[PDB]
Amino acid sequence: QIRSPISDSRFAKNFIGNTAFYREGLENWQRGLEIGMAHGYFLVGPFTTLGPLRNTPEAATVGLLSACAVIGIVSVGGLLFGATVKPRAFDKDGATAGSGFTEIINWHAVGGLGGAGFCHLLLTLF
Amino acid sequence: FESELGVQAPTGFWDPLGFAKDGSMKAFKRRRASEIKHGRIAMLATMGYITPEITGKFPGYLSPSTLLKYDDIPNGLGAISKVPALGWAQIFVYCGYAELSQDQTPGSPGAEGNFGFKVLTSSDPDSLEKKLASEIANGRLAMMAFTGMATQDGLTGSAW
Amino acid sequence: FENELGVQAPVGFWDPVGFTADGNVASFRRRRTVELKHGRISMLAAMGYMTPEITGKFPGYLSPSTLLKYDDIPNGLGAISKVPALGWAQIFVYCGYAELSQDQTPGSPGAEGNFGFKVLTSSDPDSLEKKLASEIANGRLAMMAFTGMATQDGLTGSAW
Amino acid sequence: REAPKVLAGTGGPLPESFWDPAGFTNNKTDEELLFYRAAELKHGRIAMAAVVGWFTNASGFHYLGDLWLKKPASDNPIEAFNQLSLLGVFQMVFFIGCLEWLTTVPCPPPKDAPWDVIGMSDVLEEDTDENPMAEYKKIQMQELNNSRLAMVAIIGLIVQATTTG
Amino acid sequence: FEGELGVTPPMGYFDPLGLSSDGDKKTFIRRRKSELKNGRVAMWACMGWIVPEWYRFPGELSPSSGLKFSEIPNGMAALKALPTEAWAQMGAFVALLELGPLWQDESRAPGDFKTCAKYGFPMFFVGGREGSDSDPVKNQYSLNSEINNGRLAMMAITGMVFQNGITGTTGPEMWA
Numbered sequence: 001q002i003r004s005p006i007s008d009s010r011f012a013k014n015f016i017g018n019t020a021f022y023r024e025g026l027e028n029w030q031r032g033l034e035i036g037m038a039h040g041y042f043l044v045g046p047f048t049t050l051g052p053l054r055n056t057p058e059a060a061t062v063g064l065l066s067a068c069a070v071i072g073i074v075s076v077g078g079l080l081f082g083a084t085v086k087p088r089a090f091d092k093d094g095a096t097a098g099s100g101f102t103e104i105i106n107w108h109a110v111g112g113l114g115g116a117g118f119c120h121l122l123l124t125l126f
Numbered sequence: 127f128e129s130e131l132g133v134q135a136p137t138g139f140w141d142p143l144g145f146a147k148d149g150s151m152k153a154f155k156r157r158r159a160s161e162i163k164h165g166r167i168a169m170l171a172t173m174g175y176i177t178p179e180i181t182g183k184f185p186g187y188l189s190p191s192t193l194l195k196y197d198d199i200p201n202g203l204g205a206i207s208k209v210p211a212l213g214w215a216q217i218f219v220y221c222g223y224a225e226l227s228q229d230q231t232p233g234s235p236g237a238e239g240n241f242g243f244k245v246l247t248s249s250d251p252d253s254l255e256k257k258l259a260s261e262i263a264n265g266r267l268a269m270m271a272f273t274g275m276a277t278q279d280g281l282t283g284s285a286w
Numbered sequence: 287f288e289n290e291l292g293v294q295a296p297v298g299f300w301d302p303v304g305f306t307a308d309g310n311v312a313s314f315r316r317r318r319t320v321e322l323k324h325g326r327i328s329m330l331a332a333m334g335y336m337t338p339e340i341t342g343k344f345p346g347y348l349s350p351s352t353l354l355k356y357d358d359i360p361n362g363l364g365a366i367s368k369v370p371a372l373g374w375a376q377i378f379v380y381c382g383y384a385e386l387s388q389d390q391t392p393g394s395p396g397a398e399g400n401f402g403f404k405v406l407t408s409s410d411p412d413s414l415e416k417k418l419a420s421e422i423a424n425g426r427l428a429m430m431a432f433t434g435m436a437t438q439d440g441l442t443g444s445a446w
Numbered sequence: 447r448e449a450p451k452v453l454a455g456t457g458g459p460l461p462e463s464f465w466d467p468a469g470f471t472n473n474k475t476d477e478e479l480l481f482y483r484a485a486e487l488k489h490g491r492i493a494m495a496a497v498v499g500w501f502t503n504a505s506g507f508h509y510l511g512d513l514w515l516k517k518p519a520s521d522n523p524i525e526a527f528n529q530l531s532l533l534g535v536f537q538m539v540f541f542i543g544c545l546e547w548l549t550t551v552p553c554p555p556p557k558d559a560p561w562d563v564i565g566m567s568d569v570l571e572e573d574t575d576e577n578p579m580a581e582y583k584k585i586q587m588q589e590l591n592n593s594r595l596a597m598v599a600i601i602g603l604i605v606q607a608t609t610t611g
Numbered sequence: 612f613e614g615e616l617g618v619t620p621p622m623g624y625f626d627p628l629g630l631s632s633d634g635d636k637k638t639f640i641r642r643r644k645s646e647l648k649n650g651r652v653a654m655w656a657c658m659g660w661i662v663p664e665w666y667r668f669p670g671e672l673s674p675s676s677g678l679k680f681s682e683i684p685n686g687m688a689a690l691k692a693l694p695t696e697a698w699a700q701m702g703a704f705v706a707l708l709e710l711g712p713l714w715q716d717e718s719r720a721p722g723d724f725k726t727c728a729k730y731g732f733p734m735f736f737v738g739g740r741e742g743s744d745s746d747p748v749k750n751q752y753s754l755n756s757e758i759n760n761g762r763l764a765m766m767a768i769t770g771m772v773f774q775n776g777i778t779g780t781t782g783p784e785m786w787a
């Protein structure tokens with residue numbers, strides 16, 4: 001609970017607090033979708049270039065496939081975490097332990113696929 | 127606001143794009159000030175176009191050092207580059223002093239278009255509204271006429 | 287506005303058209319300001335038109351990069367061109383500092399004329415008012431004199 | 447005329463040197479004067495950064511653009527900026543827009559101190575007399591004075607260039 | 612949600628699948644903002660598909676590349692014909708619009724942006740000098756006109772995208 005400007009200034013409180021993982025008014029699926037879109041759009045990057053098939057016409061497609069694979073693997077890991085730990089930090093009233101976190105991870109997988117596809121689209125075009 | 131000087135008769139409260147809904151007052155007050163000032167400038171400029179056309183260009187030399195007989199400066203667009211940059215600076219300074227005179231800050235007597243000309247101060251014969259509304263209506267008409275005049279001056283190529 | 291500066295022996299009510307409202311305290315304070323300022327500037331200008339011809343122009347360069355020995359610059363008017371724009375810009379920045387250092391907004395002690403240049407720093411004696419009156423009288427004389435000299439070298443070559 | 451007490455001795459040749467010679471402070475509510483200070487500090491911080499960027503571009507430290515242009519970029523910061531592709535310029539515009547969005551929509555600045563975009567006023571206490579090393583007002587004045595100086599310095603650099611070469 | 616702006620006599624309160632069957636006013640407000648923004652974007656896109664076939668702009672896109680407005684193929688071929696700098700600049704402009712003047716304030720009405728006048732007039736872009744604020748009761752006819760015109764233009768832009776995908780062209784064949 002120590003106070004530091006990096007972790008207790010108003011910018012930090014309203015920045016981490018307004019992220020998808022913490023933003024008020026967001027359903028679990030919205031948080032998952034937003035985090036997934038961010039992760040998927042990021043992950044296409046380091047694969048299309050800096051990869052085995054760099055200097056090939058299908059570099060963007062291979063990067064997209066690898067980014068989707070990484071999103072799927074981390075989503076399986078998140079499902080594993082929700083099945084084992086059941087974080088319970090996002091569950092609504094009643095429901096079951098870890099339902100909110102599992103929904104977040106599933107929609108993170110969906111958003112990761114979406115963001116990876118969007119990055120691949122923006123690479124093939126323009 | 128639905129009863130100010132602007133509403134003449136041919137059109138009532140003419141706010142087609144709804145700038146008045148939930149009248150912000152201060153917004154409307156400063157927009158009325160802008161309307162008054164723009165109309166006055168438009169009237170002056172419409173003079174500055176239609177009078178040099180009929181009345182000949184000033185008998186004089188404008189710049190005593192750079193041979194501007196007012197005849198090499200054409201009436202219309204393009205005179206921006208013909209009048210000296212120093213002359214433009216000086217007319218700019220005149221306007222700047224005229225405004226940086228009596229304040230037109232929000233709420234001040236300068237903020238409603240009142241500045242202190244009083245050329246036509248009719249002795250309150252139910253005619254203060256006459257002169258105010260006439261100035262506003264002629265301001266709107268002169269701004270529209272100015273826009274049309276500048277479009278004719280540029281589109282056609284010169285003057286009219 | 288009776289016992290300030292202007293009252294002296296030959297005249298002291300000299301105002302054929304001024305004192306428009308006979309009041310406007312702020313207007314008269316601003317007018318005494320411009321009086322003291324224009325007076326000082328006119329005195330410096332008259333000296334700068336008076337020191338060159340007798341006790342001849344300084345020996346030196348004034349611009350060793352551009353070799354503009356103080357003497358070869360024309361005495362009157364024409365000096366506005368040959369002195370480099372670098373030096374003119376430095377003159378202008380000195381003037382801007384001298385005016386904007388102390389606040390010129392009306393009401394301040396610097397508004398009425400006291401710029402804090404108390405060389406003799408008269409410790410509010412009876413000498414204060416007589417020094418003020420001599421300053422303002424020589425200021426009016428210097429304004430007239432420098433307008434005359436500027437006209438003279440505008441119509442006949444150098445300052446004479 | 448004294449300071450409007452919402453600025454309250456925060457600038458001038460000296461700290462208590464309310465300097466406005468244009469009547470840009472009178473008959474103005476506290477929110478507007480706070481806006482003026484926030485605009486001054488933002489313009490400053492931007493300038494103070496821009497002066498350092500100019501002097502590190504005009505000193506040959508112009509990588510990341512040495513590589514983008516694939517050849518040594520111009521030392522003149524204006525020409526160096528012109529050498530940048532429109533993609534890079536609009537990336538800079540987009541990043542500054544995202545930063546401005548951050549400090550308005552998700553992380554609004556404190557109401558009484560709009561210049562505190564980082565929200566530093568929620569972790570700092572104040573300058574107090576019990577503190578032998580109290581310098582928060584002093585560093586605020588350092589920031590303000592360097593801001594006001596760099597605001598004219600960067601304009602001197604920009605207008606001096608593109609008109610003299 | 613019958614009684615909200617958008618309900619129009621030709622269909623009435625539609626909701627066949629019952630997406631907004633429950634109350635959850637937050638979800639309805641979100642979907643109303645989405646509907647209004649998609650409708651506005653689709654009306655913009657339908658104009659951007661109609662007008663270029665009549666008024667190819669006078670000048671040139673890139674003066675240093677000679678690309679004139681009269682040669683970029685209309686429809687879904689400018690995606691791979693217009694230079695990527697132009698597309699990136701358009702995307703950045705839309706980003707600045709939505710992050711700046713056109714960021715929805717949750718207290719205001721769903722489609723209400725303070726910076727815009729009634730018929731969509733950008734009363735910002737003029738010193739940034741604010742605009743209207745939503746009054747549903749007086750402009751209700753214009754409100755529903757905008758909403759269902761946006762619906763029609765969304766269906767229209769989808770149809771025209773598929774027309775370009777099928778016929779390959781955007782001349783007379785696409786429009787039939």
Ligand code: CLA
Nearest residue numbers: 130132133137138139140141145146157158160161266269
């Ligand atoms: C910039 C000039 C200007 C300004 C500030 C105003 C301001 C005002 N007018 Mg007004 N008016 C103007 C010009 C202007 N008018 C002109 C030229 C006409 C003639 C067509 C009128 C006719 C008119 C009527 C008939 C009425 C008003 C009324 C009003 C008041 C309420 C409406 C409102 O909020 O408008 C806010 C101000 C604006 C919306 C101005 C924005 C103009 C946009 C930006 C441009 C419009 C298109 C333009 C021609 C494009 C030219 C090209 C350009 C991009 C280069 C307000 C004080 C009403 C009133 O007085 O009620 C009491 C009223 O009944 N006006």
Ligand SMILES: CC(=O)O[C@H]1CC(C)(C)C(=C=C/C(C)=C/C=C/C=C/C=C(C)/C=C2C=C(/C=C/[C@@]34O[C@]3(C)C[C@@H](O)CC4(C)C)C(=O)O/2)[C@](C)(O)C1
Nearest residue numbers: 654657658730731732733760763764767768770771785786
């Ligand atoms: C800067 C400035 O001054 O601007 C200001 C000016 C304004 C006016 C205030 C303003 C605004 C907004 C306004 C009111 C504009 C209105 C928009 C409405 C658009 C409606 C549209 C598109 C609807 C359609 C549907 C279409 C589809 C039809 C077809 O194609 C289809 C599917 C298939 C073809 O086979 C056959 C077809 C039948 C052909 C079509 O084609 O039309 C603005 C810009 O916001 C500000």
Ligand code: KC1
Nearest residue numbers: 188189190191192209210212213214216217218219220221
């Ligand atoms: C009483 C104070 C006064 C003086 C003493 C003065 C003197 C000169 N004016 Mg002048 N002037 C005003 C006041 C004064 N002007 C006012 C109130 C206005 C209305 C806005 C105005 C308008 C213009 C315009 C439009 C031009 C102009 C010029 C010159 C000029 C030529 C110098 C040169 O050519 O060497 C000289 C000496 C021309 C120009 O060149 O500006 C430098 C030119 O175009 N002035």
Ligand code: KC1
Nearest residue numbers: 153156157158160161164167269273734737738739740741
């Ligand atoms: C083409 C026609 C035209 C229109 C349609 C128009 C409209 C508006 N002008 Mg305007 N204008 C000109 C032409 C037009 N202006 C010209 C030729 C000049 C040079 C003489 C000029 C000068 C200024 C200045 C100095 C200001 C100004 C403003 C506004 C304003 C905001 C009011 C409001 O929205 O509250 C609106 C709507 C003020 C503003 O807020 O600017 C940030 C302001 O200070 N204008």
Ligand SMILES: CC1=C(/C=C/C(C)=C/C=C/C(C)=C/C=C/C=C(C)/C=C/C=C(C)/C=C/C2=C(C)CCCC2(C)C)C(C)(C)CCC1
Nearest residue numbers: 033037038039040041042110111113114115116117118119
């Ligand atoms: C640089 C910088 C920074 C930042 C960084 C970062 C963090 C970045 C990131 C970035 C990013 C990371 C971005 C992202 C983006 C994303 C996107 C743009 C996405 C999109 C997506 C989409 C759009 C999708 C869609 C979809 C879905 C939803 C599903 C289905 C399918 C589809 C496709 C339809 C900082 C401040 C630190 C500082 C320094 C500078």
